[PDB]
Design a protein around this ligand. Structure first.
Ligand SMILES: *[C@@H]1O[C@H](CO)[C@@H](O[C@@H]2O[C@H](CO)[C@@H](O[C@@H]3O[C@H](CO[C@@H]4O[C@H](CO)[C@@H](O[C@H]5O[C@H](CO)[C@@H](O)[C@H](O)[C@@H]5O)[C@H](O)[C@@H]4O)[C@@H](O)[C@H](O[C@H]4O[C@H](CO)[C@@H](O)[C@H](O)[C@@H]4O)[C@@H]3O)[C@H](O)[C@H]2NC(C)=O)[C@H](O)[C@H]1NC(C)=O
Ligand SMILES: *[C@@H]1O[C@H](CO)[C@@H](O[C@@H]2O[C@H](CO)[C@@H](O[C@@H]3O[C@H](CO)[C@@H](O)[C@H](O)[C@@H]3O)[C@H](O)[C@H]2NC(C)=O)[C@H](O)[C@H]1NC(C)=O
Ligand SMILES: *[C@@H]1O[C@H](CO)[C@@H](O[C@@H]2O[C@H](CO)[C@@H](O)[C@H](O)[C@H]2NC(C)=O)[C@H](O)[C@H]1NC(C)=O
Ligand SMILES: *[C@@H]1O[C@H](CO)[C@@H](O[C@@H]2O[C@H](CO)[C@@H](O)[C@H](O)[C@H]2NC(C)=O)[C@H](O)[C@H]1NC(C)=O
Ligand SMILES: *[C@@H]1O[C@H](CO)[C@@H](O[C@@H]2O[C@H](CO)[C@@H](O)[C@H](O)[C@H]2NC(C)=O)[C@H](O)[C@H]1NC(C)=O
Ligand SMILES: *[C@@H]1O[C@H](CO)[C@@H](O[C@@H]2O[C@H](CO)[C@@H](O)[C@H](O)[C@H]2NC(C)=O)[C@H](O)[C@H]1NC(C)=O
Ligand code: NAG
Ligand code: NAG
Ligand code: NAG
Ligand code: NAG
Ligand code: NAG
Ligand code: NAG
Ligand code: NAG
Ligand code: NAG
Ligand code: MN
Ligand code: MN
Ligand code: MN
Ligand code: MN
Ligand code: MN
Ligand code: MN
Ligand code: MN
Ligand code: MN
Ligand code: NA
Lengths: 690, 920, 91
């Protein structure tokens, strides 16, 4: 019918496709002027013109390859492929969108190489001792989770220059610990000793060959070491098919970027590898410590999982450093480093417990939406991450890609990928802004005779002032009283009085303060709406009175974000499960709850009411939370049936409830510091006597 | 926006010498010549045995572009003994800090090392050389009898320096007291008068210094940067220093009193490792004569559109109020890894608009990462958040990044042009660049048309070529321009005139000039300084009757003017710049006479009518407010008709109603130019007879006062007609209303107590909290959700104290959260115990009454009642095996509102909390 | 304050002998114990004890022998800083 492509359309082949994803053009080999023009498929279809003349490109989500997700990722087969599909071809017409899917899996036995990065300042002398046999002890523990293991060692103290270094007396340079009446070795910025190897005996051998040095100022820059161990992959020997864990052990504070100004170091850190054949960091004296941003970028590019093993005094500090470096987990390190072997295994559990997609090289012209399927069939829109997973689980994501207009950019490409993973989804983008008939030239004259001219795709757009299919008028007087068909709903003013009608076409006048477009001049820019006084909030383009929002912006006013990060709580659940997330702000559903993340609910029931739902399905295998098969997703708490339930739990809760069997169950809830929380359930409850 | 990037001053020292690492102006009172001071550490000198001691070079504006090193030390290392140096001085980074006030120059070497004269050590104490005229003294306050890291040995004093309004240096050093940092202030006269070259540690009278603190402040790096300003009424410049690693590397800025060195104010960064306090600066950006604080955080990470962290850097802008704590705003960077907050340089009043300006530098951003300097203009409201100009680095990378903008100094006028200029240091390419400010001209141009209405039958003027009478009018374009500072007397302006700007390209001209016979014309005008608005004339003949068929549509006379460069100062290439925000073109419109009646003048009657679909507007939140305007013109056509909506301060106008056919769109734009906010809507040009138009405008009121009863909108129509050009002003008001949704909620923790109690016996006189029974906890929350707040409320708790003379729920304690007090009619915890349905009806009642203060939207008030189940009363004889439900109720009544002299109503409700004890 | 006080042998016993010092008034980060023989080339031996512990034990030497034991105090500032005055006793 009248629609949009029919009227308010009809300028040119390329200009008709840019109107709507649903539009089409025709070159009918004849001249029934009428209104075949630019129109929909179904409309143009019953008007005939279909010797392939209809040009209706459709957006394509075609996959170029999708290998099946593997089962065991250790050895044989080929191409472990923990992500699928891998390469798909995205082809988008102007202002259109298509959607595809991606599935990722944490695969069973997967190769794991772990690189030990250790502080060697004097307060780690106790730590270096007990680490002697922990190379082979780590072999047996990681053997359970992974058959193919690699370990390597590297050391750091601080920048070997004043003020950090002991520069005097000259009697103490080779022995920086002199007044201590003992002997250590000169300090070093970063020292790489053992490259990653599958021989765990080779680890213990290089340990205890190493010894401890001394420094002056308390902060010990290990960020030089972390940066180098990440980007020197050739030197330290990261596998490309394996899970990369970098364990960072220190008991004290750390130097941050711009601290090196005191030592006279004004050169910013470059993400390059300066560790040479001498296995020492050469730029340590000449180059500043790396910023958190530069560390984050290179840590992500090389797929390195950074673990902070730190003492209880400084553990809260590195927690907050890790909060600025997503994907990095922290753990409490004992003073003598007897806890690392267990802390490593726990850290790997966290790292493989989460899945989050990252985007590389994304063209800004198109934006990516996200829905998430993590727990059975339940979808969580707007989220590009999943939480609470165990190895072997598989999750899905649905993604939508939408453009504005369309570029001639030579189609580029971009990457979708989970963090810390080698496998990725590569999307080749393509844009067809224009019909196929444009390659047939026909430069000017043709059907529009002398006085220059033009003919394109079955129509003639001729001249500066000449208008029609037959070029005429051009304000020679030449007065058509056009009336009908120069304005709809006959009786209304001509071309809306914005612009005017000459020769039958409306050439819109009063072009200033923005441009006036449209065949009836009904469309324009700047006609859109405002939010705080700023049109479309500045987050969207204005196209004929409507806003086309920028990436990560939605809504009529384009003031609504797609960001869920400000909805994310400290426990990992967005809005604490107590509300929906809308435009970056939570809206709490559960009665009596409020806060940014709905974290505050003083009138909510006690944990005894909450955590008893877990003990039902997990222990007695019944009640609610069981039939949803979420019995172990939401319940991550360790539960152990016991006698007693003694006193000394300190921070703890004692809980009593009556199950459907009319018996009284008694359990306890207890946790250690920021660590895990455990439920102690009293075995053999109290039941009515016979 | 007035900085000249075409022909700056290029200064280049030796390569590898970090030439440009620090910059300042030198304005001695001895002469009229002004010089550039450029520090260059890592520079090889003639000092014997010294490698890369560093220099400070004196560069002149004499246009020879030459720099000369200043002699400060010129000597090698002094000796503690034979073959035992007292000082080391090699790679001391002399010139890393250079600052000059009038005739005195201070330069420092923060990497200078000391032997300590007691044991053999190399301690980076740092030293400075203060030169006035020929005399040169050494100022090294951190060099003292306090030696080791717990002392001042690693202080590196001179890391940052600054002067004060009257002869006092502010010297910071990050390494004092295990790198806690230190600020030391000394009178300049004291430094000169007390200098003894044979004394390595000089005690200065009236020395202001910070003292060592607890070891938890170690590695704070106080004295990393310094600035001076007056943040109290004393009148003396006080001390501002960045502490980038302070407070768990969040970063801090300390403000010390410039008189007795006591702490005054504090600042703290919001993000760790961002290096909050790397750069500090003090200026008055808003003109309120109170110094304002600028704090740079070059490594700060904001969130992009995707939400991922990205390092763009940010700068904290804190405006000082005469009353107290500041008003702080944040300014984020643009490019990633550009380190936006690296250097903050105040520069006088750059455009001479009356408000001081400032420059923020991102040394590693820009094209090819050469460095960018952003210029920010000040305003009456504070700093303008948008840059008015950018400066790009012109020098390539070489070994290390060019670091263009790593150091800057402004606020000094090195030429007599009357505008302050700017120095930018690079030191990566070992260069320094001087940008001269160009003078600013404010130009206003008037345009008039004699007459505004054209009659085609009124042909008067004769065409030049052939004798025929043609309908004509006159167009006068007047031009006046002036500005402050140095600029020429007569200015050359090139003005263009366009007739009928609407119809162009392929169209009818409909109007041409008499002599040139052309739709367009050009003129060369020359005006002079202030006043004396000049004018010229060419006159506008109108085309033949019915030579267009287009009447109605106004003929827009368009004037635009440029400035031919030509005239400039003797400064050899400094041309003025037009004012930043000012139109370069002005338009007037002539109308052909049509349907103006027998009087040949168009006199309309304009009318505005507004009904009220919206009735109540609730205080405390934004809400849709839509006014329907009925603008009708009964009479002859109205030229350039516009609907004028004069709004209140609370308006916040947005968009228009699209969704109705009854009211058909509109053309409306928000604008505030002269002293008034308002909304303008075009009613058509011309707005013809009849023409009853319906439309709607949407508003969101953030209200005001809380003493306000109503909000005021005044509406009228305006036009260009000579008579009856306007409409009677119509006013519509919607009343403020009070709506507060207040709920009371409660919870029992636990809601169940199962009997009997495990491991419980009976003590007849117990003080345990274990011998009484389990802990039953009732929590009541009074929350105000609705948009309106309330000032006072009452809360009544009914509690089941006893049943049949013995205790049910023994209250140990009760705690409050929020603006509330509470009182118990019975003594709580009288025994001093320390760590079917039973309500207060038909049982002994313990009442707890509470008074509630002001509760706004996001806030609530909570009462926590911790009680003990009295096991002795249950379980005994009359209660052995039965199910009892302990019930407590709480009601609330809202008695007052802050909105007095506005309708109130009332709010009241109640909820009950139950604790059920059971056997089975 | 800056120095430990009156270290004295507690348990009369063969190896796994015990010593005890007393409460430096300053805040102590760590304690460093060093021990070996008297006058030969000497096999220096050492270990570290947290500042909260006032006692230590030794594995080696003889049931009874003439030795030398020294105890260092560790300043909680910088990387590793020790006080000026360590304390020793023979046995
Ligand atoms: C802007 O931020 C700044 C950065 O934090 C703020 O500066 C800080 O202000 C704090 C508040 O005054 C101040 O804390 C006070 O420190 C002094 C230091 O004097 C001491 O003298 C003793 C012998 O030298 C030693 O202290 C003993 O006691 C401590 C426990 O406090 C033990 O740990 C020690 O071993 C020792 O036995 C110290 O060596 C130190 O030199 C204290 O005297 C003050 O004591 C006050 O509190 C106690 C109770 O806690 C009272 O009995 C006593 O009468 C005092 O009222 C404070 O602890 C920080 O030192 C100071 N930090 C810096 C770097 O300046 C600044 O206030 C803030 N301003 C604004 C406007 O926000
Ligand atoms: C983006 O801008 C639009 C328009 O400026 C905002 O629309 C307004 O949103 C509010 C809700 O946030 C709508 O609700 C109105 O507020 C009261 C508050 O209690 C609510 O109870 C009523 O339902 C009332 O309609 C409001 O109608 C709507 N339109 C307006 C004010 O004209 C939108 O919220 C903005 N989005 C973001 C994320 O900022
Ligand atoms: C994610 O799921 C949502 C579910 O709402 C999809 O939202 C679309 O938008 C409308 C507007 O509310 C929804 O009602 C429909 O469910 C969706 N429209 C359709 C399917 O035409 C959203 O498209 C989904 N995104 C992805 C990438 O799958
Ligand atoms: C200042 O002079 C010293 C002279 O020693 C220069 O230092 C030497 O530089 C060369 C070439 O860069 C090196 O091969 C030598 O090893 C350096 N000397 C030492 C002792 O290491 C220094 O480069 C000069 N600096 C400037 C800015 O000219
Ligand atoms: C008819 O045209 C004449 C000539 O343009 C008009 O006379 C002009 O009036 C304006 C003021 O309205 C003066 O600024 C011009 O200088 C006059 N021009 C002359 C006298 O040549 C006249 O106003 C027009 N209308 C009539 C006569 O009704
Ligand atoms: C709660 O009781 C206090 C103490 O009587 C009331 O007093 C307020 O606080 C100080 C005392 O610490 C008084 O000098 C102020 O005049 C009071 N301030 C305000 C804002 O009232 C307090 O008002 C009571 N609160 C309520 C809500 O009634
Ligand atoms: C889009 O919808 C789902 C994801 O929401 C996707 O699997 C499907 O293939 C797409 N369907 C269409 C019609 O584009
Ligand atoms: C870390 O950050 C949290 C809040 O994010 C804060 O409560 C805590 O004090 C911080 N700890 C340290 C050591 O900075
Ligand atoms: C929980 O109950 C047991 C059993 O009486 C008791 O020993 C323990 O102290 C209780 N724990 C707490 C935290 O009250
Ligand atoms: C320091 O600051 C001013 C003096 O300028 C005075 O008001 C204040 O009381 C002084 N305090 C101390 C402790 O000297
Ligand atoms: C004339 O000035 C306006 C603003 O006053 C500006 O938007 C426009 O670009 C200028 N030039 C024209 C209209 O040619
Ligand atoms: C207590 O018993 C009453 C009896 O009507 C019931 O309404 C209430 O929900 C019970 N409270 C509980 C089970 O917490
Ligand atoms: C409760 O105690 C009062 C105290 O005088 C007494 O008068 C009353 O009779 C008692 N009630 C019962 C039911 O024992
Ligand atoms: C009291 O609250 C109930 C819901 O809890 C509601 O239905 C009722 O209308 C409220 N009454 C008043 C007077 O606020
Ligand atoms: Mn250390
Ligand atoms: Mn240790
Ligand atoms: Mn260190
Ligand atoms: Mn002051
Ligand atoms: Mn100010
Ligand atoms: Mn200014
Ligand atoms: Mn100047
Ligand atoms: Mn009239
Ligand atoms: Na004509």
């Amino acid at each position: 019918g009248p629609n949009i492509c029919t009227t308010r359309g009809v300028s040119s082949c390329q200009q008709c496709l840019a109107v709507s994803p649903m539009c089409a053009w025709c070159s009918d080999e004849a001249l029934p002027l009428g209104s075949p023009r630019c129109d929909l498929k179904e409309n143009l279809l019953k008007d005939n013109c279909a010797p392939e003349s209809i040009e209706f490109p459709v957006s394509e989500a075609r996959v170029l390859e999708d290998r099946p997700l593997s089962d065991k990722g250790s050895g044989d087969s080929s191409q472990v492929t923990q992500v699928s599909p891998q390469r798909i071809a995205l082809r988008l017409r102007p202002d259109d969108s298509k959607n595809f899917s991606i599935q990722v899996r944490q695969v069973e036995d997967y190769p794991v190489d772990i690189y030990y990065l250790m502080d060697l300042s004097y307060s780690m002398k106790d730590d270096l001792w007990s680490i002697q046999n922990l190379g082979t002890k780590l072999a047996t523990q990681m053997r359970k989770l992974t058959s193919n293991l690699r370990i390597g060692f590297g050391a750091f103290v601080d920048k070997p220059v004043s003020p950090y270094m002991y520069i005097s007396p000259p009697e103490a340079l080779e022995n920086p610990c002199y007044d201590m009446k003992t002997t250590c070795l000169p300090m070093f910025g970063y020292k790489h000793v053992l490259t990653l190897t599958d021989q765990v005996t080779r680890f213990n051998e290089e340990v205890k060959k190493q010894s401890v040095s001394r420094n002056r100022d308390a902060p010990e820059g290990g960020f030089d070491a972390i940066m180098q161990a990440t980007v020197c992959d050739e030197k330290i020997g990261w596998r490309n098919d394996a899970s990369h864990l970098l364990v960072f052990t220190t008991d004290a504070k750390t130097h941050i970027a711009l601290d090196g100004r005191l030592a006279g170091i004004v050169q910013p850190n470059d993400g390059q590898c300066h560790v040479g054949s001498d296995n020492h960091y050469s730029a340590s004296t000449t180059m500043d410590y790396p910023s958190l941003g530069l560390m984050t970028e290179k840590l992500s590019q090389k797929n390195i999982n950074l673990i902070f093993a730190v003492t209880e005094n400084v553990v809260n500090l590195y927690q907050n450093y890790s909060e600025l470096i997503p994907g990095t987990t922290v753990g409490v390190l004992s003073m003598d480093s007897s806890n690392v072997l267990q802390l490593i295994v726990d850290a790997y559990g966290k790292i493989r417990s989460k899945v989050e997609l990252e985007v590389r090289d994304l063209p800004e012209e198109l934006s990516l939406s996200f829905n998430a399927t993590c727990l059975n069939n339940e979808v969580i829109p707007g989220l590009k991450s999943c939480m609470g997973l165990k190895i072997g689980d598989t999750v899905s994501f649905s993604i939508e890609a939408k453009v504005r207009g369309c570029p001639q950019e030579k189609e580029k490409s971009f990457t979708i990928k989970p963090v810390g993973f080698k496998d990725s989804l590569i999307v080749q983008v393509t844009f067809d802004c224009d019909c196929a008939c444009q390659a047939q030239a026909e430069p000017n004259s043709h059907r529009c005779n002398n006085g220059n001219g033009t003919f394109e795709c079955g129509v003639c757009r001729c001249g500066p002032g000449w208008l029609g299919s037959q070029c005429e008028c051009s304000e020679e007087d030449y007065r058509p009283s056009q009336q009908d068909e120069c304005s709809p709903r006959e009786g209304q003013p001509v071309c809306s009085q914005r612009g005017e009608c000459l020769c039958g076409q409306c050439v819109c006048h009063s072009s200033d303060f923005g441009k006036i477009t449209g065949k009836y001049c009904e469309c324009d820019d700047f006609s859109c709406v405002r939010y705080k006084g700023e049109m479309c909030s500045g987050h969207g383009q204005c196209s004929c009175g409507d806003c086309l929002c920028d990436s990560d912006w939605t809504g009529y006013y384009c003031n609504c974000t797609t960001r869920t990060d400000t909805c994310m709580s400290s426990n990992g659940l967005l809005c604490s499960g107590r509300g929906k997330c809308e435009c970056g702000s939570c809206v709490c559903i559960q009665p009596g709850s409020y806060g940014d993340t709905c974290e505050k609910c003083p009138t909510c029931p006690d944990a005894c009411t909450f955590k008893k739902e877990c003990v039902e399905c997990k222990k007695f295998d019944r009640g609610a939370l069981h039939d949803e098969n979420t019995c172990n997703r939401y319940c991550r708490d360790e539960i152990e049936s016991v006698k007693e339930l003694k006193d000394t739990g300190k921070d703890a809760v004692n809980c009593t409830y009556k199950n459907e069997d009319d018996c009284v169950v008694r359990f306890q809830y207890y946790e250690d510091s920021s660590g895990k929380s455990i439920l102690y359930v009293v075995e053999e409850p109290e039941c009515p006597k016979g | 926006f007035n900085l000249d990037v075409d022909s700056p001053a290029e200064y280049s020292g030796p390569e590898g010498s970090y030439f440009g690492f620090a910059v300042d102006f030198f304005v001695p009172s001895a002469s009229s010549r002004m010089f550039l001071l450029v520090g260059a550490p890592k520079a090889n000198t003639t000092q014997p045995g010294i490698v890369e001691g560093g220099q400070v070079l004196k560069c002149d504006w004499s246009s020879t572009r030459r720099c000369q090193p200043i002699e400060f030390d010129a000597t090698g290392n002094r000796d503690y003994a034979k073959d035992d140096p007292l000082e080391f001085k090699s790679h001391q980074w002399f010139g890393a800090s250079v600052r000059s006030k009038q005739d005195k120059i201070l330069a420092c070497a923060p990497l200078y090392h000391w032997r300590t004269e007691m044991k053999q050590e190399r301690e980076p104490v740092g030293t400075c050389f203060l030169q006035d005229g020929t005399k040169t003294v050494e100022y090294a306050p951190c060099r003292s009898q306090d030696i080791d890291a717990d002392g001042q040995g690693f202080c590196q004093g001179g890391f940052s320096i600054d002067f004060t309004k009257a002869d006092r240096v502010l010297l910071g050093g990050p390494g004092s007291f295990y790198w806690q940092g230190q600020l030391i202030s000394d009178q300049v006269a004291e430094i000169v008068s007390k200098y003894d070259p044979n004394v390595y540690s000089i005690k200065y009278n009236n020395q202001l210094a910070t003292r060592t603190a607890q070891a938890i402040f170690d590695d704070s790096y106080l004295g990393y940067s310094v600035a001076v300003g007056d943040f109290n009424g004393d009148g003396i410049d006080d001390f501002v220093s960045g502490v980038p690693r302070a407070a768990r590397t969040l970063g801090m800025v300390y403000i010390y009193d410039g008189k007795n060195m006591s702490s005054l104010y504090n600042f703290t960064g919001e993000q760790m490792a961002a290096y909050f306090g790397f750069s500090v600066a003090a200026t008055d950006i808003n003109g309120d004569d109170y110094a304002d604080v600028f704090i740079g955080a070059p490594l700060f990470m904001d969130r992009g559109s995707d939400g991922k962290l990205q390092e763009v850097g940010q700068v904290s802008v804190s405006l000082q109020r005469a009353s107290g704590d500041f008003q702080t705003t944040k300014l984020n960077g643009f490019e990633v890894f550009a380190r936006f907050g690296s250097a903050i340089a105040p520069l006088g009043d750059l455009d001479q608009d009356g408000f001081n300006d400032i420059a923020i530098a991102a040394p590693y951003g820009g094209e090819d990462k050469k460095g960018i300097v952003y210029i920010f203009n000040g305003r009456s409201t504070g700093l303008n958040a948008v840059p008015s100009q950018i400066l790009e680095g012109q020098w390539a990378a070489r070994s290390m990044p060019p670091s263009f903008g790593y150091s800057m100094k402004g606020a000094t006028d090195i030429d007599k042009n009357g505008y302050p200029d700017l120095i930018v240091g690079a030191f990566g390419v070992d260069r320094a660049i001087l940008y001269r400010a160009r003078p600013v001209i404010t130009v206003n141009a008037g345009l008039e048309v004699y007459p505004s209405i054209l009659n085609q039958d009124n042909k008067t003027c004769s065409l030049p070529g052939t004798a025929l009478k043609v309908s004509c009018f006159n167009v006068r374009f007047c031009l006046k321009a002036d500005g402050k500072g140095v600029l020429p007397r007569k200015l050359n302006f090139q003005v263009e005139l366009l007739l009928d700007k609407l119809k162009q390209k392929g169209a009818i001209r409909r109007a041409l000039f008499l002599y040139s016979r052309s739709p367009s014309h050009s003129k060369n005008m020359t005006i002079s300084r202030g006043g004396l608005m000049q004018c010229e004339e060419l006159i506008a003949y109108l085309r033949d009757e019915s030579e267009f068929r287009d009447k109605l549509t106004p003929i827009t006379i368009f004037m635009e003017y440029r400035l031919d460069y030509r005239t400039a100062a003797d400064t050899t290439g400094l041309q003025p710049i037009l004012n930043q925000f000012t139109p370069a073109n002005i338009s007037r419109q002539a109308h052909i006479l049509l349907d103006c009646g027998e009087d040949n003048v168009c006199k309309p009657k304009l009318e505005v009518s507004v009904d009220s679909d919206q009735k109540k507007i609730y205080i405390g939140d934004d809400n849709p407010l839509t006014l329907i305007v009925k603008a009708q013109n009964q009479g002859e056509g109205a030229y350039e008709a516009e609907l004028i909506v004069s709004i209140p301060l609370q308006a916040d106008f947005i968009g228009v109603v699209r969704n109705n056919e009854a009211l058909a769109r509109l053309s409306c734009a928000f604008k505030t130019e002269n002293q008034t906010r308002q909304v303008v809507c075009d009613l058509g040009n011309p707005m013809k007879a009849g023409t009853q138009l319906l439309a709607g405008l949407r508003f969101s009121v953030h209200q005001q006062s809380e003493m306000d009863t109503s909000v005021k909108f005044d509406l009228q129509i305006q036009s260009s007609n000579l008579f009856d050009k306007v409409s009677p002003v119509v006013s519509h008001k919607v009343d403020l209303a009070v709506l507060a949704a207040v709920e009371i909620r409660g919870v029992s923790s636990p809601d169940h107590v199962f009997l009997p109690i495990p491991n419980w016996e009976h003590k007849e006189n117990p003080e345990t909290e274990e011998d009484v029974g389990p802990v039953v906890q009732h929590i009541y929350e009074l929350r105000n959700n609705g948009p309106s707040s309330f000032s006072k409320a009452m809360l009544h708790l009914q509690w089941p104290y006893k049943y049949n003379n013995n205790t049910l729920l023994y209250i140990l304690h009760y705690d409050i959260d929020g603006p509330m007090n509470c009182t118990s009619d019975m003594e709580i915890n009288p025994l001093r115990i320390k760590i079917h349905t039973l309500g207060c009806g038909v049982a002994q009642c313990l009442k707890i009454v509470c008074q509630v203060g002001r509760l706004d939207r996001g806030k609530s008030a909570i009462l926590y009642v911790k009680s003990l189940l009295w096991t002795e009363t249950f379980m005994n004889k009359e209660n052995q095996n039965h199910s009892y439900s302990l019930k407590s109720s709480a009601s609330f009544n809202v008695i007052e509102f802050p909105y007095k002299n506005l309708p109130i109503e009332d709010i009241t409700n109640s909820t009950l909390v139950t604790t059920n004890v059971t056997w089975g | 304050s800056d120095v430990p006080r009156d270290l004295e042998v507690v348990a009369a016993t063969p190896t796994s002998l015990l010593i005890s010092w007393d409460a430096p008034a300053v805040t102590v980060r760590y304690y460093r114990i060093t021990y070996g023989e008297t006058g030969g080339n000497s096999p220096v031996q050492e270990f570290t004890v947290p500042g909260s512990k006032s006692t230590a034990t030794i594995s080696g030497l003889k049931p009874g022998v003439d030795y030398t034991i020294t105890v260092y105090a560790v300043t909680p500032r910088g990387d590793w800083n020790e006080g000026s005055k360590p304390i020793s006793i023979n046995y």
